[PDB]
Amino acid sequence: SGAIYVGNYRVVNRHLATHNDWANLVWEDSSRDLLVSSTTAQGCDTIARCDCQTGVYYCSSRRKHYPVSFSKPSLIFVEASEYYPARYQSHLMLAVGHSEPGDCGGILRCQHGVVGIVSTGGNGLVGFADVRDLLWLDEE
Numbered sequence: 001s002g003a004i005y006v007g008n009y010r011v012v013n014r015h016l017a018t019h020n021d022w023a024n025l026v027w028e029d030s031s032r033d034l035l036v037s038s039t040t041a042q043g044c045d046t047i048a049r050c051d052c053q054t055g056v057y058y059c060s061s062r063r064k065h066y067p068v069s070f071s072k073p074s075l076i077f078v079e080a081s082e083y084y085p086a087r088y089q090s091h092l093m094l095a096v097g098h099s100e101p102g103d104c105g106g107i108l109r110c111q112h113g114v115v116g117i118v119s120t121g122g123n124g125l126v127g128f129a130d131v132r133d134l135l136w137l138d139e140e
């Protein structure tokens, strides 16, 4: 679990979105495993605007933050998980590291702020859904 709180926006994994998220929907994309809903309170997070390939992510299943190198956002084949079939996921970044299903929502950050959230794992990789292209998160 986990979300990004930027302005009056909540960014979650689409597969973990609540009824309240869907009832307050701003934007969702299944191919990216992202959903954004409206908030009443303003949030503490800053979105990275950058092409960093190094940063740090939170892994709830280790209670640890790990420094990683990660690929640039790409269209990647993902094997079946408890929450999705085998399918192609867009805007996905991969690193070498530990990720189980409950680790989804964990933040990946770089020197510029929040890069994305854990979305995939298995086979010694963790995949992160990028949010750095979502410029509209920073306004309105």
Ligand SMILES: CNS(=O)(=O)c1ccccc1Cl
Binding pocket: 073, 074, 075, 076, 089, 090, 091, 092
């Ligand atoms: C797998 N998706 S993707 O290649 O990251 C991508 C798709 C559409 C627009 C921009 C990008 Cl980066």
Ligand SMILES: [Zn+2]
Binding pocket: 048, 049, 050, 051, 052, 110, 111, 112, 113
């Ligand atoms: Zn950066």
